[PDB]
């Protein structure tokens, strides 16, 4: 996307991705939108992802999909997908697909 010195920008539709606190299996996800202006700047993304998912360790430094993928930039992102906010720790591959669609609890 060679962004020259042109005013009106081309078709740049935003992306709505869901975030989830790493190591958290009690709270659901968080539908957050990322503008194309920020998508390019991965650093800018994490700065916003934290606002929705504030890790106890601090802020977010990297993202991880439910499959265990690593998104270092806005190239691995998708439209309407789920991701996890991983800080300065290891990816705790946990079941998130369940937190999405509520499910009757066992202990009761």
Curated annotation (Swiss-Prot):
It is found in: Cell projection, Cilium; Cytoplasm, Cytoskeleton, Cilium axoneme; Cell projection, Kinocilium; Cytoplasm, Cytoskeleton. Residues 15-97 form the Doublecortin domain. It comes from the Eukaryota. Ubiquitously expressed. In brain, highly expressed in the entorhinal cortex, inferior temporal cortex, medial temporal cortex, hypothalamus, amygdala and hippocampus. Expressed in liver by cholangiocytes, the epithelial cells of the bile ducts (at protein level). It is linked to Dyslexia 2: A relatively common, complex cognitive disorder characterized by an impairment of reading performance despite adequate motivational, educational and intellectual opportunities. It is a multifactorial trait, with evidence for familial clustering and heritability. Nephronophthisis 19: A form of nephronophthisis, an autosomal recessive disorder characterized by chronic tubulointerstitial nephritis resulting in end-stage renal disease. NPHP19 patients also manifest hepatosplenomegaly, hepatic fibrosis, destruction of the bile ducts, focal bile ductal proliferation, ductal plate malformation, and cholestasis. Interacts with DVL1, DVL2 and DVL3. Protein that plays a role in the inhibition of canonical Wnt signaling pathway. May be involved in neuronal migration during development of the cerebral neocortex. Involved in the control of ciliogenesis and ciliary length. This is Doublecortin domain-containing protein 2. It comes from Homo sapiens (Human). The gene is DCDC2. The chain holds residues 132 to 226 of 476 of the full protein.
